[PDB]
Amino acid sequence: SPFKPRNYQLELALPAMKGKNTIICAPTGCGKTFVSLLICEHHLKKFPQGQKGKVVFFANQIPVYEQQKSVFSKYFERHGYRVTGISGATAENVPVEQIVENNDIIILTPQILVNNLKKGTIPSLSIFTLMIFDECHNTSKQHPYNMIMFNYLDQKLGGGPLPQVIGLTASVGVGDAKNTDEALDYICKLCASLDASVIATVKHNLEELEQVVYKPQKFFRKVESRISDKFKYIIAQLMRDTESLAKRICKDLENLSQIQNREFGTQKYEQWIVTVQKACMVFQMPKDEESRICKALFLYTSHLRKYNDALIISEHARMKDALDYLKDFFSNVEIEQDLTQRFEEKLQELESVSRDPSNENPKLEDLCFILQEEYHLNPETITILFVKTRALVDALKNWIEGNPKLSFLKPGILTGRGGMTLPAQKCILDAFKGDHNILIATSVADEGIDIAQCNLVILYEYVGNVIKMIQTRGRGRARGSKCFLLTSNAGVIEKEQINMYKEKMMNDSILRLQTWDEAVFREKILHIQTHEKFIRDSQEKENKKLLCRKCKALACYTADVRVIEECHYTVLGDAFKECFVSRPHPKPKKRAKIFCARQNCSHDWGIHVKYKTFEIPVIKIESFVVEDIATGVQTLYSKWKDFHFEKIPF
Amino acid sequence: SPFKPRNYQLELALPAMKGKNTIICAPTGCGKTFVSLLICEHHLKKFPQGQKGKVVFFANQIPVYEQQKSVFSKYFERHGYRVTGISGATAENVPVEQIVENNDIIILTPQILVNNLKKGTIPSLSIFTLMIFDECHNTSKQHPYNMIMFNYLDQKLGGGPLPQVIGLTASVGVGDAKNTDEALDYICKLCASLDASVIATVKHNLEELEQVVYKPQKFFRKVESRISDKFKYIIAQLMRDTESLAKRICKDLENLSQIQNREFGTQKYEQWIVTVQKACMVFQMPKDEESRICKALFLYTSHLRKYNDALIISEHARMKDALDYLKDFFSNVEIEQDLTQRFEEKLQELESVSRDPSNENPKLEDLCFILQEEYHLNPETITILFVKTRALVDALKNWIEGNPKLSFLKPGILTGRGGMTLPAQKCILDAFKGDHNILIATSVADEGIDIAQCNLVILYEYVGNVIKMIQTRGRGRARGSKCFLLTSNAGVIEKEQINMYKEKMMNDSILRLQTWDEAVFREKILHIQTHEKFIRDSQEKENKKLLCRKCKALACYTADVRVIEECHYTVLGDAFKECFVSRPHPKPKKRAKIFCARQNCSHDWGIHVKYKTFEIPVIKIESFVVEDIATGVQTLYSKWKDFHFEKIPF
RNA sequence: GACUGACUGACUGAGACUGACUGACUGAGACUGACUGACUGA
RNA sequence: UCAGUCAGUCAGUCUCAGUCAGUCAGUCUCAGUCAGUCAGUC
Numbered sequence A, B: 001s002p003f004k005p006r007n008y009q010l011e012l013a014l015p016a017m018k019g020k021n022t023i024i025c026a027p028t029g030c031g032k033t034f035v036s037l038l039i040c041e042h043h044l045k046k047f048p049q050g051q052k053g054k055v056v057f058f059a060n061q062i063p064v065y066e067q068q069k070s071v072f073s074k075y076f077e078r079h080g081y082r083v084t085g086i087s088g089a090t091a092e093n094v095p096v097e098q099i100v101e102n103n104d105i106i107i108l109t110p111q112i113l114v115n116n117l118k119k120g121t122i123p124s125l126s127i128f129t130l131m132i133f134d135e136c137h138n139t140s141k142q143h144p145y146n147m148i149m150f151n152y153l154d155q156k157l158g159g160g161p162l163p164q165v166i167g168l169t170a171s172v173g174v175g176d177a178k179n180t181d182e183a184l185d186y187i188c189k190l191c192a193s194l195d196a197s198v199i200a201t202v203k204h205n206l207e208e209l210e211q212v213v214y215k216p217q218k219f220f221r222k223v224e225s226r227i228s229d230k231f232k233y234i235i236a237q238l239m240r241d242t243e244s245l246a247k248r249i250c251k252d253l254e255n256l257s258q259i260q261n262r263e264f265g266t267q268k269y270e271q272w273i274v275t276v277q278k279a280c281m282v283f284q285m286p287k288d289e290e291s292r293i294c295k296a297l298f299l300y301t302s303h304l305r306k307y308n309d310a311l312i313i314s315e316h317a318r319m320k321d322a323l324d325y326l327k328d329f330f331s332n333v334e335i336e337q338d339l340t341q342r343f344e345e346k347l348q349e350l351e352s353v354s355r356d357p358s359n360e361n362p363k364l365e366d367l368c369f370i371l372q373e374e375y376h377l378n379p380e381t382i383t384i385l386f387v388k389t390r391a392l393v394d395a396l397k398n399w400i401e402g403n404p405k406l407s408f409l410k411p412g413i414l415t416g417r418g419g420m421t422l423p424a425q426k427c428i429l430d431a432f433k434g435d436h437n438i439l440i441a442t443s444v445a446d447e448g449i450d451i452a453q454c455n456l457v458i459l460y461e462y463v464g465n466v467i468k469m470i471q472t473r474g475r476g477r478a479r480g481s482k483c484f485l486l487t488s489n490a491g492v493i494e495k496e497q498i499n500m501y502k503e504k505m506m507n508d509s510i511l512r513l514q515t516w517d518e519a520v521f522r523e524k525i526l527h528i529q530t531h532e533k534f535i536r537d538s539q540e541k542e543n544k545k546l547l548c549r550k551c552k553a554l555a556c557y558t559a560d561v562r563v564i565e566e567c568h569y570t571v572l573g574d575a576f577k578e579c580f581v582s583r584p585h586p587k588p589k590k591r592a593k594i595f596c597a598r599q600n601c602s603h604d605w606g607i608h609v610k611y612k613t614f615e616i617p618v619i620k621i622e623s624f625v626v627e628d629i630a631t632g633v634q635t636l637y638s639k640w641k642d643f644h645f646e647k648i649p650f
Numbered sequence C: 001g002a003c004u005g006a007c008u009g010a011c012u013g014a015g016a017c018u019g020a021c022u023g024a025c026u027g028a029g030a031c032u033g034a035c036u037g038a039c040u041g042a
Numbered sequence D: 001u002c003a004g005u006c007a008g009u010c011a012g013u014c015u016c017a018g019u020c021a022g023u024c025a026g027u028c029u030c031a032g033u034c035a036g037u038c039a040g041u042c
């Protein structure tokens, strides 16, 4: 009620009010949600007595879903329209076939609608009259939005009434253009993909926009690395030693992988290790010596990979975290005794260099400096920090809570479900309206969190396509806000600069497109839709052995595996009941795990679980190598979809 | 005699008359009791001279038992058949082994039959020839009906004659179906669980049903809450203060429980308090300071819980009740002096806001409005009001009797035994045939009270599965009746709507099932019974220390506890005779209670009681913490079944 | 013949106490599967 | 075109806690009426 509609909202609403399928392109923070409110209200009130229509509203991430549902519920309570929502949260849900019919406004996540359409419970899209697509720029190759549109267009082009389509965006996306022409082509293809005739952008009331919406400012921070790293040097020495050990047993392995000049802390090295594994555990010999060599190479490569992960975490996260991870692996888990001696040799030196604060990670130093100086300048402010990986979320949480210098900070974690839950996310969000001052977020904090007060956005080695850049920068709804990209690589800065340009070129291309005459636009859109529909339509149309990946013991055969509930795999038979051994006090204790029978091979196959009445063990294809019963060939399967056999029920 | 059989009763009776085990599904109020009368009469009269058979009739709740017994007694007096009943009421009962043999019709409560079968006094079910199951929808996981059926089926499938089985219902129940298929599966499993081949529903004489039976109408009433509550605010301020006090002593209490964002008036907060208790009184220290901290945290948490209960009662019941409860706790029952000062500080403000009628609970306001307007419209009517908890029964009784505006109302309480007694329930029921006009009832008023005149049913925040919805709505036998769900939460309304749908989907699924061909139905039923029987058959196959929960004083040892009559626990020895102290004038006076010896700890352990000749004290495991005599570990036992020891007689 | 006292038993009616069972409602955790997109490397 | 990492989205199977309401088993008590039996004074 207290919200007073501004002029530019009416301007944007106009074409949709008329009743054409439209796309709205506006800068972040202008209040496109209120525009959707007004369009929905005007469209619904238009119908005559005795006839009513439905409204559908999607969202990708759960917190966005929750806040949109709350906004709609608060706005439309007074008119008496009944709204509702569906999500993964609702358990034992009433069948949707009629919860669509009972209510007026329905909020969803597109996967639900796609599921129902594929199953067929919802007959056709004609039950609806208005479809609103938030963050509409994602309508592309296989995103669920595009599958919904595929159903829509396949229905329209062949032979019932169809609903109006409205899309909202803050950046339509440029794709991979190298010139204005390809940007124009990409935008035209996008508009065709969702059957829109009009693109609406505010121009008449621009000046009003400038003092209504404050554009955030951008900054870069390059941080150099240390020339001398004791931990890096000693771990690299361990790398050289372990590599020599691995080299000595094998006849050759320089030649096995085409990769060359492998650095130590690079992902290329990790790919090399994975390739050497997948090439060596598949290597066969004419027999116990074969298993022994396989075991030795497996252990060597596993420790190599674990140390490489420790190195990358060390160069990203703080000093202590890498040693924590390594010590946990060693303690939790012959040759392995030798390697344990090797690590325990250096442990104390590693701890000593870790507790020397002079060798602290420079990135953390500069991040402390930025937070300190900002919070000195403004005592009160709400800032968001963006990372790549949840492990880094936990690491930064601990490091922030453990710094006496940053007594100001009050942390709040935020991440996608699976793991924080839905009500926890809702509470953390609502608290910011409160005693929290900093929010550590993963990728879910894009596409609109709408915190009314945010003046600082920090990117911790977080870059990508232009869409992510714009959606990250836009989070600073509060005026005077700033964004800081912190990194230790110049190429990242270059990518950021070129992405800024790409944004500019897209913004010019859309203005060029707006000049085109109507009904030629629609004609070329129809042509593109027809061509793409033709392309898609014509686009598409035993008893083997399984053995332990580490000791090559004959685990089982696919003739004895019965799938339960189409989604779990198990095997019956006393023969399998000897080939493994459980653990007396399993590490989770929260149920007993499976392990290789021979004391030589401590390899985790699967886990126990109980179906309705029966306790049974289940295995993962990630544990075995498959071997033909006729020939001696082998492959490796990482995922049951690739494996092909006689899938048999319980 | 004056009852004239209607057509649909004969239609329903037909399959049972033939002699197959059947289920009857009919809408509420159609007179299924008379159908049972006719089936029983026809079945009993069929036998030839010199041979006779028995009839058994169950019921769950005592008032239903009483009214069914009265109905059978009045009907079958003229034929000369001898009926009788058994229940928990009969004291010094003649042994049943032959009160079954002496009479023809026997009325019971299934727990009696299960008790006798487990003990073995009744040899086998073959003594009977007809078993009638009223409210048959309860035959499920562990309900006594299902155990009786388990005996029946275990006898039948393995290797004497067996009795016919008839069941009656008004709603078979849908379980947790999400589609018609799962509803059909649930109904098939239900029919299998009680070995029925035919489901009977009236279709030919439907039109007769519509003017014979009036369907009650349904309505919803959403009530908003007050934005500003003085009592809520002040009690919340006390919450914040007490929480700060509790926080200060303990090193950490945030991290002990995974629960987050605890609201004040929620059950989640109560669970948090219970978790903090069960985690803190078990916490051990290397000694008097340990007891002091335990006492302090105990008192803080106890007052927190009591205030939270006051808050929830206040938001449910009237203003005065919460203060009544709190004052009674404080008056009945160092640090406690401090907290008493804290409460007495605010007492007068609490009373002042309580006696301001403008801040009355809105739910009570709207309930007064509904009763007023109805009784204005119709001066004479009989209405029933449904609540969750007996405490609310008393509160509503007082509040209704104390309102000058509602001079019309004449109240009648009704609740299960243990506490009103059986003859009191019978008198209250018979009075409604009289000067009473409103009945306040707990859950016992479901599954059929059969008040010939009821035109108004009110639900005070009472919702559940579809069975409860249907059985609650059906109570309005009188035509023109109505049902009103009053609530202050929208999710409750949504649950009610989805339950209405679930009823519709079940009613369609049963009609689908009726189409199936005979002897395939029975075949799949036999398959289900066999599978379930196999599943059930294979499904199943010291001197420690006890100390005071509040002061950690060494109470006793399990080596000195002797159980009497297998059901009371006591301890002998002068050592225990010092560890406690009785009270001179105990609060019940009706016998002396037990309390902790030290004046620091006023904690009630148990109560005195006299066996045939000897006065002895008995204790409750609810009073102590158990500690190993060898190690320092502790657990908490809430119920003697969990505790395992050397149970020794007197 | 009628006067006052004490005892026993049988029948009721009412209360308080202690133990186990079932069901419904929540709140929170663990496990296994499939899908999409973005980034790299070759 | 292939590989490998990362992050989001859904489907399905499980469990533990805590409150609530019903159902049974067992040990007790106080009241009031009734009918018998005795002692003592007239």
Ligand SMILES: Nc1ncnc2c1ncn2[C@@H]1O[C@H](COP(=O)(O)OP(=O)(O)O)[C@@H](O)[C@H]1O
Pocket (backbone or CB within 6 Å): A003, A004, A005, A006, A026, A027, A028, A029, A030, A031, A032, A033, A034, A170, A448, A450, A452, A474
């Ligand atoms: N009439 C109005 N006056 C002031 N603020 C408004 C008005 N309408 C909407 N807003 C603000 O706009 C915000 C929603 O913007 P949103 O559309 O989510 O941004 P974006 O365009 O980036 O998606 C809300 O936080 C609300 O405070």
Ligand SMILES: Nc1ncnc2c1ncn2[C@@H]1O[C@H](COP(=O)(O)OP(=O)(O)O)[C@@H](O)[C@H]1O
Pocket (backbone or CB within 6 Å): B003, B004, B005, B006, B026, B027, B028, B029, B030, B031, B032, B033, B034, B170, B448, B450, B452, B474
């Ligand atoms: N022949 C009849 N004529 C009129 N009323 C009848 C007749 N037979 C039974 N009734 C009524 O049916 C009621 C019993 O219904 P009941 O079977 O308990 O309902 P429900 O089907 O919900 O269990 C009684 O109150 C009685 O008055």
Ligand code: ALF
Pocket (backbone or CB within 6 Å): A028, A029, A032, A135, A169, A170, A447, A448, A449, A450, A471, A474
């Ligand atoms: F649509 Al936005 F922040 F870009 F809510």
Ligand code: ALF
Pocket (backbone or CB within 6 Å): B028, B029, B032, B135, B169, B170, B447, B448, B449, B450, B471, B474
């Ligand atoms: F069986 Al009913 F009211 F449902 F007596």
Ligand SMILES: [Mg+2]
Pocket (backbone or CB within 6 Å): A032, A033, A447, A448
């Ligand atoms: Mg938005």
Ligand SMILES: [Mg+2]
Pocket (backbone or CB within 6 Å): B032, B033, B447, B448
């Ligand atoms: Mg009935």
Ligand SMILES: [Zn+2]
Pocket (backbone or CB within 6 Å): A548, A549, A550, A551, A552, A553, A596, A597, A601, A602, A603
């Ligand atoms: Zn192995």
Ligand SMILES: [Zn+2]
Pocket (backbone or CB within 6 Å): B548, B549, B550, B551, B552, B553, B596, B597, B601, B602, B603
């Ligand atoms: Zn004590």
